[PDB]
Write a protein that binds this ligand. Sequence first.
Ligand code: ADP
Ligand code: BEF
Ligand code: ZN
Ligand code: ZN
Ligand code: ZN
Ligand code: ZN
Lengths: 356, 111, 151
Amino acid sequence: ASLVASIVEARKKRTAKKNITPYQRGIIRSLILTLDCSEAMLEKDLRPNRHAMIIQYAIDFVHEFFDQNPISQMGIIIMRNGLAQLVSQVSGNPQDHIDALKSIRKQEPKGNPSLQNALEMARGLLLPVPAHCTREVLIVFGSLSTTDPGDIHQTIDSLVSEKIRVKVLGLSAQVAICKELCKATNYGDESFYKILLDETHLKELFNEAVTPLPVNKINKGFTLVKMGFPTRIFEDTPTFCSCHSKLVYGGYFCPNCHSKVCSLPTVCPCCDLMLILSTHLARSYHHLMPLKTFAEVPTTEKFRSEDCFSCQSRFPILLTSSRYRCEDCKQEFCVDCDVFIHEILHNCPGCESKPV
Amino acid sequence: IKPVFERFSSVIITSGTISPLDMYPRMLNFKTVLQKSYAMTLAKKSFLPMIITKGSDQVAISSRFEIRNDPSIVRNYGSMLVEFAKITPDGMVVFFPSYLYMESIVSMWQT
Amino acid sequence: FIKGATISYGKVKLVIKHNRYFVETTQADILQMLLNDSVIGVHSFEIANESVEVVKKRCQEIDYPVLEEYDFRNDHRNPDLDIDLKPSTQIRPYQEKSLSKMFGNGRARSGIIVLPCGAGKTLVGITAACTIKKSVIVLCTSSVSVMQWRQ
Ligand SMILES: Nc1ncnc2c1ncn2[C@@H]1O[C@H](COP(=O)(O)OP(=O)(O)O)[C@@H](O)[C@H]1O
Ligand code: BEF
Ligand SMILES: [Zn+2]
Ligand SMILES: [Zn+2]
Ligand SMILES: [Zn+2]
Ligand SMILES: [Zn+2]
């Protein structure tokens, strides 16, 4: 029964994954990461302290966010002494944000938090953003009280008018404003206010936010974005960079003005034209054509082969069939591949192998 | 209330915390065809009723009028108020046995 | 090894009344054993106060040892003293555990308590006197200690 207990738990876990449909998602994103650094964050519920762990997870989130969203930009804000402090301008450089967070890791948190101040700063920082981008705000709230100079309700209404989206991660309990902020800002959806239940659960919540959020049907904006694909060039002598004005061995050449840049993907400093590589767009393709989840094969029927199609792993004999088939191509797979094919890869080998 | 129960044939007495139900017919001279209390069939527990008999120092706490100005009890109740206010997210309601007891104890906390 | 020594406890009780020591037993069968012992000399018989150290050691050699249990709840002859720990007191977790091992059954047991130096062995004795609420005597093997013990 112990082995069956694990199997049934896997089925329950697979129950949520069954319902997958290609929802429209905004690949281009503009995130404003807000961290709470107040007296309430000095507690020891999270070892060594809330501030240390949150900063540590923030660095991991930055690494993950830019890895799967190469054509996105992020900004970092912090609440301290009842005021909102800006620590990094919105930019596409992952290193800049990580460096800023590392410096923040030293200063001790103190004072009270001010959501209205943080939201107001986020609203201003997101004002110079193209309409084709999705404006998102990730707030890490730990305090159960908010001290603000003005009316928070007015700011929430302004946030809705600006088509901003807010995600709040709590630490202790539910806050009335956070629920209202996460509800009115997300078309009444109540799934954008999450409270962690332990140290491990917090890691999943940060990882979940990486995936682009689906867009609402009524909030439909379609437009064409002008972009360019620079060609990498190797130079025998170092030359000045158009971005930092420093000696570098070489850089990508913009196809619109021939101005060189250090690293990609970034907007050209001269023609203000977003420069990217073919790989950068390719990564976000899986969010557009998600691989249909595999359905477990009942043991009543007869299996095709005793070994996995993609990894040639003999299926254990052991109650419950250890095989998962793909409806599109009807190819059995072991448990290990399905996790690997839906988390690392995003293409079913069986479907590709089938000729037409 | 006697005229009311005689002039009207059918009367329903309902409330959220009317218990025990046997006493009201005794206190007010009337008879009921049926008297029952319904228990909520909530899937998940929604309210946590708990009773506190002593403070953090293991000292019994009570609101007896004669010992209202008790240095030990006042601190114990004061500690309870502050500690709960730290974890209560939005709102907290405190109910005192009488205005005078509340009036005196609040002054003690202020000093 | 466990069987031999684990069955001995709990058959003979020593009680004190009006400064007179009575070896009280709740069964009459013990009379044929204790009274017939060469060293010795519901039924209860008197015994010399100075002879307690002799019979008790003899009780170890013989199968049944003696236990010193005091039923202070039902002892009304001895005058009582009303003393309780003040609110400022804070019983540490280990102090409570030691008391539980003594009052687990419900009857006070005479024994030894071993705590680290400075852990509060004084308060251990203070708690026993306070909870018993009867006449108590304290012996402290020093003069400076007695002064600080009282303070
Ligand atoms: N519960 C307690 N609260 C405060 N101080 C305590 C407590 N228990 C013991 N102490 C302190 O421990 C010290 C040593 O106590 P004492 O009884 O002399 O220890 P011991 O006899 O085990 O050497 C004293 O300063 C005493 O006040
Ligand atoms: F063990 Be103590 F110093 F009496
Ligand atoms: Zn440069
Ligand atoms: Zn250019
Ligand atoms: Zn496999
Ligand atoms: Zn397939």
